[PDB]
Amino acid sequence: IHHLVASAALGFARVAPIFFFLPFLNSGVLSGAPRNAIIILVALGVWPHMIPLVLQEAAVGVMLGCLLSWPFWVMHALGCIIDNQRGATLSSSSEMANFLNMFAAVVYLQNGGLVTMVDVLNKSYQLCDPMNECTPSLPPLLTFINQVAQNALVLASPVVLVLLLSEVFLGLLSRFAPQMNAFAISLTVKSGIAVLIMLLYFSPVLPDNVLRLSFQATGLSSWFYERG
Amino acid sequence: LKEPVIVSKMAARKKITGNFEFHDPNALLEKLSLQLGLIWYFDGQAIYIYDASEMRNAVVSLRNVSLNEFNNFLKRSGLYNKNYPLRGDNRKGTFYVSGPPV
Amino acid sequence: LKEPVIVSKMAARKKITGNFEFHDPNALLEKLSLQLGLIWYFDGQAIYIYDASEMRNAVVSLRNVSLNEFNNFLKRSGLYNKNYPLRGDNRKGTFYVSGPPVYVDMVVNAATMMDKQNLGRQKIGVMRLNNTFVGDRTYNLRDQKMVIPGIATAIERLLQGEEQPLG
Amino acid sequence: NDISLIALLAFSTLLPFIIASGTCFVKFSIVFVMVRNALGLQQIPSNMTLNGVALLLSMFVMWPIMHDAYVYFSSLSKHVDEGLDGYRDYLIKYSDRELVQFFENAQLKRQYGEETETVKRDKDEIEKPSIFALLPAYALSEIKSAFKIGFYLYLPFVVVDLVVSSVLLALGMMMMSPVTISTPIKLVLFVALDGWTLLSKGLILQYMDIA
Amino acid sequence: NDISLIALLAFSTLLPFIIASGTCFVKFSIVFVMVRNALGLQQIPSNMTLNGVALLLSMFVMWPIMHDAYVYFSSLSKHVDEGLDGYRDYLIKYSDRELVQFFENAKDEIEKPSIFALLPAYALSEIKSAFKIGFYLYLPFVVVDLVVSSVLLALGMMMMSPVTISTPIKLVLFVALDGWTLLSKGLILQYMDI
Amino acid sequence: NDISLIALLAFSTLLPFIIASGTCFVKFSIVFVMVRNALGLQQIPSNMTLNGVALLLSMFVMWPIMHDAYVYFSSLSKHVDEGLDGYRDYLIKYSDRELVQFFENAKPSIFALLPAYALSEIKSAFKIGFYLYLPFVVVDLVVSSVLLALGMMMMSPVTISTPIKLVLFVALDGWTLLSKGLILQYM
Amino acid sequence: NDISLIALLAFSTLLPFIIASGTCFVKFSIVFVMVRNALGLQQIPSNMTLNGVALLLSMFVMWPIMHDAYVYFSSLSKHVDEGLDGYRDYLIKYSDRELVQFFENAPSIFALLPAYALSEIKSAFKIGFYLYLPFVVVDLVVSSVLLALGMMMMSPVTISTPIKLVLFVALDGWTLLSKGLILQYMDIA
């Protein structure tokens, strides 16, 4: 009766960071009026049955929210290098990466998606139930920054090398006649080659890798252990 | 039919299509109320038509008058209907009615 | 069937297909209620059809009317259904009823409305006495009077006051 | 009559709880906010307004379904089951089949144990799922459907922004924010297309019909 | 009056639902922020005083409507429809007739439409008209944003943000034109004639 | 009691709407932020100090007006239009006359004095802010052109421009001279 | 008593300031974005990730301090001064004692937080310069091979950033400073 508030404030703690991190659940697409009603429905729907318990359950939730937001950070970092090589970002030393993140949030959401998301969240209570002191398992956490960067770089590897050859060949064009202003001549064409080259592999390659980098429920023991 | 017809809201969702011919309509209405699934009642001034899923029933006990002394009121008033009569013991107080809600 | 048919919405989700020929409907409905799993009831105006998992039951006590009299009320009215009879003692007040929900909620309501519906006439008798006298007898012993009570004073004092259930 | 105000403070929060969680208001609020982010506006049109217009269209659709719960009105839970058949049938039609089966099996695994037989799809003919499995799955199936509409709505404007940022780089104007040029010409695409009378025209036709 | 303080606090949370949707505050507050963003300002003046000027201008056309309901207004069934008939002959003027038939199905002289059928079409018609008259305001400023950005590019100063130069010119083009009073005159003459 | 205090909190709901729209604080709040953005400074003073300095300067011409309401005060319904003329002599002094007469057409009433005063304080603050924007465009262009005199075409000037912007504001001590400038237009 | 629940609103709005002041997250959040400024790509790794890893890393260091305060627990205010002893032995090991006594004589719990945070910004800014040094060698050795050719006018930034980005992930950078930063604080692995 009166203890269900504590049994739904323990569910809210784990569910809320995941909502904060995923691209189709943030504050841009979910305003304040319906937001706090969904996370009590989901938290009451996934329950398997003292201040720092809400902080321990929040730390497991931030580890789960980064693991569920693993394949969208790769597509956003793909877009920031495609948009960086063509120009349009040197005013700080975007518009393109928000399109690849919105595209991967739909091509992940059609086939499966929320089934594997609540499957991960429901298997999380089968290994890290509260009052057993679960913990986010530090020794694999240290390579998490490296993995996303490596995936983004390999994924974007064609367009950078083609725009690098367009800069060597346009640098070679200035050695025959230095009165060309070849810095700004390349700036008109690199934004058309960065679209034409990505048109040849947008359809066959890119919707496969979102379903390849998706984190599933079979790898929860390698990321979460118990102290007890 | 020389009376107005009142069709309910739930029995106005069914549809009919064809070429019809009324030359005695009280037998045509009797046949279509069984083929489509309908109940109807003529109370003297209109013809109410409901569907069969709106047939309600009730049990009422009479304290100071009998069943035959209530059936004489229904026969003299013309509200007696032979399709849905009153079921009960002939000189008692309790009986059982069922039919259209009017 | 010469009556309308009222199928419930929990027995309206099952489906059927095939070429059916209606030449004996009262035996076709009895066979299909057992092959599909159904309960049905005909009260004289319509035929109600439910599925078998909607059958409810109740036990109700009649304070001052016998079961054999209530069963003659159902036989004389027309609501007596021999498939779902009334299980109980033949001259008592308690029985057990089960069947369709429109038959149980009619039998329970018409039994508790027959406990809600439920004297001796006075009579003067004249009893002539052949071998005794009514009334008192009086005699004297030279100054004083003695009175002997008769038969009408002895029984009158026996029934005096007497808030007692005599039958 | 202040002894029932402890239940009034529950019923006046539970009545907006079903509105903000389990009815059609979730789809209309997400589409209306995502078309504000598609154009590139932050404050206007003041989503205090948009939560009123989405509630007016959702009460427009929810008016015949809720009214049957008022023509009717351990032992009271079987009475409210007869009063709640139209809402369960509305939640079945628009929730996901593969997601209700997940919330049904996780509930049976929760209550009885790990040796419970897994429920499959072939229950759907005569057996009906509970109200505690449809209600979490309906909210997620309309988050998925509203995000599906919002990506399609998002695409034309991105086509405008990627040509504007290309012609400002053809000229030597790399130190110039393209928001201040695109935001006029991103607004003509919404008034020459009259999309306010097209999103509301279509989202009503998904749930109801004309003629 | 404890049965009436709930009828006062719910009315005080019901007027923020009605004034923000079904009056001319919708069209008023949108253009003030679109002209706020057309100049290139983020925090000036605030979000609070722009709803204050728009609320004071909003009751200039609603106080002649509200006075008709105060004089006029189970007998309360047909008591409310004529108290709102002065509000419902105003909502047919600024909405779309084909759109209110779309909500009435899913002449007009012999029967006015339902009050709950045309208030969403009034809200969508004022958001659409505010987006249309809001696109017009952007254009002059965009011209003086492209001129200074292409004059500095006529010189060799490609590494120079023109926001530090365009912001003086944009608010002398709004005060030599007398812009703030000019928009409020056209907003009043679009509803109440002089 | 509760209703006699809730009506006082409904008075305190209306008080930020009057202090933000219908008084001098509309003029004071614009100029401190227009000089905040004029100096090449993004957010670095605050949004809380500038809104407290302009409010403490705003009550200096408001407390001489509102003290007569404490002096003066369906009996109270007709008296509030009687003893409120001291605010109307302040809203008729700085508001334009034809803007007042237009709102009265579409002693004058107070409801027409509120938006006509509010729509004039924004324009006069924009006119003050342009003259404040002007001595910094010159220093933005003369330090960005002597780099073009050299081979410094890839050089953002906003890190050399910013020290001269505020030393030309503390030499002219432009905060206290601006507060003293905005007071002599009212007192 | 609703004031005791208002004190929970004194916790949910103040805990971002205590984490940003006295927790070792200050050291991780500075160096993570400092190497990102060293690379030359200001949108990768996209600060939501750099704050997620820096919050989960600091929730391994604060857990042996918060756990011992739970197993332990002006009259009943004399219970908490012993509860904060596990945080007090932590705030002396990483702060200098020329600033510890300076905010006292003008160890207290309020006299060590303004000295610990100033010792962590100092201990982070001289690590980020050492990190800065190899990159300057890279974009000074790739900009000088163009001037040896006839490439005096082409911009070297668009050539410098891919040759700086494919070397840092191939030499496993982001798993070398994430290890070397947590080895200062706790017994990792």
Side-chain angles (χ1 to χ4, degrees), chain A residues 4-94 96-228, chain B, chain C residues 1-161 165-167, chain D residues 1-72 74-211, chain E residues 1-72 74-192 194, chain F residues 1-72 74-187, chain G residues 1-72 74-76 79-187 189:
Chain A
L4 187 83
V5 170
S7 163
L10 211 64
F12 182 101
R14 204 180 277 230
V15 191
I18 306 198
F19 266 54
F20 190 82
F21 274 109
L22 273 161
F24 47 87
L25 293 174
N26 43 29
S27 75
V29 303
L30 209 67
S31 158
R35 192 185 178 109
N36 299 287
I38 312 298
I39 319 173
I40 312 297
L41 265 192
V42 184
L44 281 167
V46 299
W47 190 257
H49 322 119
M50 291 176 258
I51 194 55
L53 259 47
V54 77
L55 302 173
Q56 159 197 111
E57 284 280 304
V60 195
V62 189
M63 198 70 223
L64 268 179
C66 297
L67 288 175
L68 280 157
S69 166
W70 201 18
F72 318 108
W73 285 351
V74 191
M75 287 289 157
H76 193 283
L78 160 67
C80 299
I81 309 163
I82 296 192
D83 206 4
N84 188 274
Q85 214 81 10
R86 70 185 194 88
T89 46
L90 320 179
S91 89
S92 46
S93 45
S94 177
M96 183 47 195
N98 215 346
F99 163 67
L100 288 168
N101 179 267
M102 197 82 53
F103 180 74
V106 180
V107 81
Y108 160 79
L109 214 58
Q110 208 172 26
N111 45 2
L114 307 175
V115 183
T116 81
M117 170 188 82
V118 308
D119 202 8
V120 168
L121 197 148
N122 195 21
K123 294 265 194 312
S124 166
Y125 291 109
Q126 297 297 108
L127 302 153
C128 283
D129 61 344
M131 291 75 97
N132 276 30
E133 316 195 291
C134 179
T135 290
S137 73
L138 173 85
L141 192 150
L142 304 179
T143 188
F144 185 76
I145 319 219
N146 208 344
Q147 292 256 35
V148 290
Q150 169 167 335
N151 297 338
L153 253 185
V154 290
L155 190 50
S157 42
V159 171
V160 283
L161 195 139
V162 171
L163 286 193
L164 263 169
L165 270 50
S166 87
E167 203 78 279
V168 65
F169 174 60
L170 286 183
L172 268 192
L173 173 57
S174 73
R175 214 173 63 210
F176 200 60
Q179 55 271 62
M180 288 271 265
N181 196 39
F183 163 69
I185 288 192
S186 87
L187 202 65
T188 80
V189 287
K190 281 169 96 181
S191 180
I193 315 164
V195 175
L196 178 49
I197 294 303
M198 83 168 310
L199 197 66
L200 315 171
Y201 73 105
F202 175 74
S203 91
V205 173
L206 197 145
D208 203 27
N209 289 62
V210 288
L211 320 179
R212 182 179 308 177
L213 305 153
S214 315
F215 178 63
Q216 268 145 10
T218 64
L220 271 194
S221 71
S222 66
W223 292 86
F224 297 100
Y225 75 98
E226 271 195 350
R227 321 179 70 141
Chain B
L1 303 165
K2 266 78 66 179
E3 325 297 326
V5 177
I6 302 172
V7 190
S8 87
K9 202 189 98 75
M10 199 182 153
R13 295 173 192 150
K14 321 190 168 185
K15 289 164 189 313
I16 200 161
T17 301
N19 197 339
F20 297 95
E21 186 263 337
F22 326 115
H23 83 278
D24 53 281
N26 293 290
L28 201 153
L29 181 51
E30 191 69 59
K31 194 153 63 192
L32 288 188
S33 68
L34 291 172
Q35 290 182 347
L36 269 60
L38 290 176
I39 51 175
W40 60 281
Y41 179 60
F42 164 62
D43 72 316
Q45 292 94 42
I47 302 185
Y48 301 89
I49 288 175
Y50 306 91
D51 55 346
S53 308
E54 282 170 337
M55 169 170 287
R56 87 206 311 177
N57 52 287
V59 59
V60 62
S61 89
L62 282 175
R63 284 163 317 251
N64 303 326
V65 72
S66 177
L67 184 65
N68 279 138
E69 277 103 324
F70 188 63
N71 271 120
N72 299 153
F73 168 73
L74 287 178
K75 286 189 197 298
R76 252 192 302 266
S77 86
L79 304 167
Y80 165 74
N81 196 6
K82 63 172 296 183
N83 266 322
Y84 317 114
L86 324 178
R87 307 280 166 174
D89 205 316
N90 207 11
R91 69 281 189 192
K92 282 294 292 297
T94 78
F95 57 92
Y96 175 76
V97 287
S98 45
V102 74
Chain C
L1 308 166
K2 271 97 173 180
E3 313 296 328
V5 173
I6 312 175
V7 186
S8 157
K9 75 152 52 183
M10 210 184 172
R13 306 155 170 174
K14 313 183 168 178
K15 290 170 185 319
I16 198 170
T17 176
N19 191 284
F20 290 103
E21 190 166 21
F22 307 133
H23 59 263
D24 181 21
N26 285 300
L28 182 60
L29 180 51
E30 184 72 61
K31 194 168 64 54
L32 277 190
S33 314
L34 296 180
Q35 290 182 330
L36 280 77
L38 293 175
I39 52 173
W40 63 287
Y41 178 63
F42 161 64
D43 59 330
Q45 291 95 336
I47 299 180
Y48 296 82
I49 286 169
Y50 312 93
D51 71 317
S53 67
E54 280 174 328
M55 168 183 290
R56 41 189 288 206
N57 54 334
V59 44
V60 64
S61 159
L62 297 179
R63 193 65 75 219
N64 42 6
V65 52
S66 87
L67 180 52
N68 199 29
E69 174 165 29
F70 179 74
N71 202 254
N72 285 24
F73 162 72
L74 299 188
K75 287 172 178 290
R76 220 200 296 261
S77 87
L79 310 158
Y80 183 58
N81 194 17
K82 82 168 190 301
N83 275 298
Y84 314 107
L86 286 86
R87 306 283 168 191
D89 200 68
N90 218 27
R91 67 284 187 196
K92 262 313 174 177
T94 320
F95 52 89
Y96 175 75
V97 66
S98 78
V102 75
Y103 174 63
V104 176
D105 280 357
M106 178 259 297
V107 160
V108 167
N109 269 323
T112 192
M113 274 185 180
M114 269 199 190
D115 288 347
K116 196 76 55 204
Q117 293 293 120
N118 270 317
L119 86 169
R121 294 178 294 172
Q122 304 291 280
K123 180 178 152 48
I124 290 187
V126 179
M127 303 144 186
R128 188 173 190 268
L129 313 190
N130 297 306
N131 306 319
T132 174
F133 281 103
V134 285
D136 303 338
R137 182 168 154 265
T138 314
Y139 57 91
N140 308 318
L141 284 80
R142 291 184 174 167
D143 49 43
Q144 53 171 341
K145 297 182 186 293
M146 323 285 296
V147 177
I148 313 174
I151 197 173
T153 316
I155 319 176
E156 171 172 32
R157 284 175 50 218
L158 192 58
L159 299 173
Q160 184 171 261
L166 179 47
Chain D
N1 41 6
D2 275 77
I3 60 172
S4 192
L5 258 62
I6 311 144
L8 175 48
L9 59 88
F11 194 77
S12 200
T13 178
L14 212 63
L15 165 57
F17 184 73
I18 306 310
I19 288 172
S21 60
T23 183
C24 189
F25 181 77
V26 293
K27 172 174 270 171
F28 278 97
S29 190
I30 295 177
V31 175
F32 276 171
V33 170
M34 219 186 316
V35 66
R36 183 188 69 186
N37 208 237
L39 305 158
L41 312 177
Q42 313 296 18
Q43 316 98 354
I44 51 154
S46 277
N47 56 26
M48 172 146 188
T49 52
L50 267 65
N51 293 349
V53 194
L55 191 151
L56 281 154
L57 298 167
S58 287
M59 271 315 189
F60 179 76
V61 185
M62 290 283 105
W63 189 251
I65 298 143
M66 163 176 40
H67 195 28
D68 311 329
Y70 202 52
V71 187
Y72 173 73
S74 279
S75 281
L76 292 164
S77 180
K78 75 154 170 224
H79 305 172
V80 77
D81 209 316
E82 196 273 348
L84 286 198
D85 300 68
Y87 191 56
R88 184 176 289 172
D89 210 317
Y90 155 76
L91 292 166
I92 282 183
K93 183 176 173 65
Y94 297 100
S95 86
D96 263 349
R97 177 39 59 173
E98 63 184 290
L99 186 63
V100 300
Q101 194 197 346
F102 191 85
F103 279 106
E104 262 281 289
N105 308 350
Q107 216 271 349
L108 274 194
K109 281 267 307 163
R110 172 201 303 170
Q111 172 179 180
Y112 297 107
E114 51 184 341
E115 313 282 90
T116 308
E117 277 312 279
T118 319
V119 177
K120 262 44 184 183
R121 187 272 179 191
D122 51 308
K123 57 149 192 304
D124 70 280
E125 295 62 27
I126 177 61
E127 171 67 341
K128 228 180 180 179
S130 65
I131 209 67
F132 283 154
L134 300 169
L135 205 47
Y138 177 72
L140 261 71
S141 316
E142 300 193 317
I143 291 180
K144 183 261 289 181
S145 196
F147 196 84
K148 167 164 286 301
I149 309 178
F151 169 64
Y152 282 130
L153 262 296
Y154 204 77
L155 284 164
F157 305 135
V158 189
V159 180
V160 173
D161 302 348
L162 276 175
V163 71
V164 163
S165 297
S166 177
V167 289
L168 295 180
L169 289 191
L171 306 164
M173 299 176 56
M174 69 167 309
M175 283 295 304
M176 170 78 186
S177 188
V179 172
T180 52
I181 303 183
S182 75
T183 313
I185 73 170
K186 212 192 298 184
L187 275 166
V188 191
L189 266 297
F190 215 75
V191 290
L193 196 140
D194 67 22
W196 284 111
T197 79
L198 271 186
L199 314 183
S200 59
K201 197 76 65 68
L203 285 160
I204 290 296
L205 286 171
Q206 291 181 1
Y207 292 89
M208 199 71 190
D209 74 279
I210 68 184
Chain E
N1 38 43
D2 55 353
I3 211 167
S4 198
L5 59 88
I6 45 184
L8 177 49
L9 296 191
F11 254 101
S12 296
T13 75
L14 167 58
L15 305 118
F17 176 77
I18 296 300
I19 294 176
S21 160
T23 75
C24 78
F25 173 60
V26 181
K27 197 186 168 180
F28 281 0
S29 53
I30 289 177
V31 195
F32 282 146
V33 193
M34 288 182 77
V35 74
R36 200 255 298 276
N37 299 299
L39 309 160
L41 306 181
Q42 281 95 2
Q43 296 176 358
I44 287 297
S46 48
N47 282 316
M48 175 172 258
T49 180
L50 293 187
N51 313 327
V53 287
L55 207 156
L56 294 161
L57 288 156
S58 305
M59 326 270 140
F60 272 124
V61 300
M62 292 306 166
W63 199 27
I65 302 192
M66 272 165 76
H67 185 231
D68 304 359
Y70 200 87
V71 56
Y72 197 86
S74 188
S75 81
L76 308 190
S77 279
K78 65 161 101 173
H79 270 205
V80 58
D81 59 8
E82 186 59 74
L84 277 298
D85 205 79
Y87 187 51
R88 84 195 297 175
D89 60 339
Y90 160 74
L91 288 171
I92 50 182
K93 181 166 289 176
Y94 294 92
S95 86
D96 184 13
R97 196 187 188 269
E98 188 69 343
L99 191 61
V100 303
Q101 294 275 75
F102 183 74
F103 301 139
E104 212 177 18
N105 198 317
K107 264 171 211 193
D108 288 29
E109 174 151 351
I110 199 166
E111 190 213 18
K112 289 191 185 103
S114 298
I115 186 71
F116 291 129
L118 84 170
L119 175 59
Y122 167 69
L124 294 172
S125 298
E126 305 266 338
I127 299 174
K128 173 201 155 56
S129 62
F131 275 140
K132 172 186 280 218
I133 80 172
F135 159 69
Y136 275 126
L137 270 301
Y138 267 91
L139 250 323
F141 301 127
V142 177
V143 181
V144 306
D145 212 297
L146 266 300
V147 170
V148 306
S149 199
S150 42
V151 162
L152 305 181
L153 261 299
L155 306 170
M157 62 175 56
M158 44 186 45
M159 298 275 319
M160 172 85 226
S161 70
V163 195
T164 51
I165 307 184
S166 317
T167 306
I169 309 172
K170 273 174 183 153
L171 56 93
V172 304
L173 196 63
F174 209 56
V175 306
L177 195 141
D178 275 338
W180 276 111
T181 173
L182 200 52
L183 308 171
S184 64
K185 298 197 60 53
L187 269 52
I188 290 299
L189 293 29
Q190 203 168 5
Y191 294 98
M192 211 64 166
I194 203 53
Chain F
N1 214 306
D2 55 355
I3 301 170
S4 55
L5 274 302
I6 212 63
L8 204 54
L9 298 176
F11 204 99
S12 279
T13 295
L14 63 66
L15 282 173
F17 286 107
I18 311 300
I19 199 74
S21 88
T23 176
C24 49
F25 187 49
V26 191
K27 180 190 264 277
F28 297 80
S29 316
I30 311 299
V31 198
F32 294 144
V33 181
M34 198 89 77
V35 306
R36 187 177 98 186
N37 283 17
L39 297 168
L41 310 181
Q42 216 55 58
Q43 48 85 16
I44 62 169
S46 91
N47 267 38
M48 310 164 267
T49 77
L50 259 55
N51 276 4
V53 167
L55 182 54
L56 286 159
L57 279 152
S58 195
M59 320 295 288
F60 277 117
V61 310
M62 279 289 89
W63 189 65
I65 290 290
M66 75 206 203
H67 192 79
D68 291 85
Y70 193 38
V71 162
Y72 178 74
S74 162
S75 312
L76 302 103
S77 87
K78 332 292 191 173
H79 285 214
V80 286
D81 206 86
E82 168 177 48
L84 261 184
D85 299 312
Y87 197 59
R88 301 166 61 187
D89 314 316
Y90 174 69
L91 292 193
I92 288 167
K93 176 180 167 70
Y94 292 96
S95 86
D96 292 18
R97 196 149 30 168
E98 312 188 359
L99 267 163
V100 171
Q101 298 298 351
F102 163 68
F103 293 143
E104 297 177 82
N105 198 340
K107 185 63 69 177
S109 189
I110 179 63
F111 272 126
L113 313 181
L114 291 175
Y117 169 75
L119 274 180
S120 44
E121 294 291 62
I122 300 183
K123 175 214 292 293
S124 45
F126 275 12
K127 210 187 300 169
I128 296 177
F130 167 60
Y131 281 107
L132 273 296
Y133 261 103
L134 290 180
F136 301 135
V137 176
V138 191
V139 67
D140 264 329
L141 277 150
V142 303
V143 77
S144 193
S145 46
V146 306
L147 320 172
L148 258 56
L150 299 172
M152 304 204 180
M153 80 304 295
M154 305 278 257
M155 183 64 205
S156 201
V158 305
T159 184
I160 322 180
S161 318
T162 319
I164 324 173
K165 282 199 199 197
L166 83 163
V167 73
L168 261 54
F169 206 76
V170 288
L172 318 177
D173 77 348
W175 291 106
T176 174
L177 197 147
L178 203 163
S179 277
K180 290 164 94 65
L182 307 184
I183 289 302
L184 315 172
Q185 320 186 11
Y186 292 94
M187 302 304 298
Chain G
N1 179 264
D2 271 27
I3 291 155
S4 45
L5 295 66
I6 280 289
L8 200 72
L9 283 68
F11 210 103
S12 278
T13 76
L14 209 68
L15 211 49
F17 281 88
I18 310 146
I19 294 171
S21 184
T23 295
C24 76
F25 168 72
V26 182
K27 193 153 189 168
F28 294 122
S29 88
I30 284 175
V31 180
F32 274 165
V33 63
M34 189 100 85
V35 191
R36 195 187 72 186
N37 293 8
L39 266 296
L41 267 168
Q42 294 276 301
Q43 290 97 311
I44 173 174
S46 73
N47 292 318
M48 173 167 38
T49 81
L50 293 180
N51 276 86
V53 192
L55 200 164
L56 298 153
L57 274 178
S58 80
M59 191 80 206
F60 281 107
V61 174
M62 298 310 137
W63 190 87
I65 293 166
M66 202 57 199
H67 183 96
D68 296 349
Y70 169 68
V71 308
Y72 171 75
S74 159
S75 64
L76 277 151
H79 263 282
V80 64
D81 47 1
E82 294 176 59
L84 318 172
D85 190 292
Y87 192 59
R88 199 190 300 251
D89 43 23
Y90 177 64
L91 294 171
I92 314 165
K93 203 171 79 76
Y94 291 117
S95 53
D96 287 331
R97 311 154 53 182
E98 307 92 350
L99 298 147
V100 161
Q101 97 294 336
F102 188 76
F103 302 124
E104 201 185 330
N105 52 6
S108 298
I109 183 67
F110 297 115
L112 260 71
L113 268 192
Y116 167 70
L118 287 167
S119 186
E120 297 278 45
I121 314 182
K122 173 180 291 202
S123 175
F125 264 80
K126 64 178 182 288
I127 297 190
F129 157 67
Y130 265 116
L131 301 186
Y132 275 155
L133 241 330
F135 288 138
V136 175
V137 184
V138 179
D139 70 350
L140 263 295
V141 80
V142 63
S143 176
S144 315
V145 79
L146 291 172
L147 318 180
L149 321 172
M151 305 320 185
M152 296 60 68
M153 193 207 164
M154 266 316 307
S155 160
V157 177
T158 55
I159 293 144
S160 280
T161 53
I163 209 167
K164 274 188 285 184
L165 201 82
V166 309
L167 201 51
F168 194 73
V169 289
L171 297 201
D172 273 20
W174 293 97
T175 174
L176 264 174
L177 82 159
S178 44
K179 277 153 62 132
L181 270 170
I182 203 59
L183 296 197
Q184 172 184 138
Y185 281 89
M186 75 167 301
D187 175 77

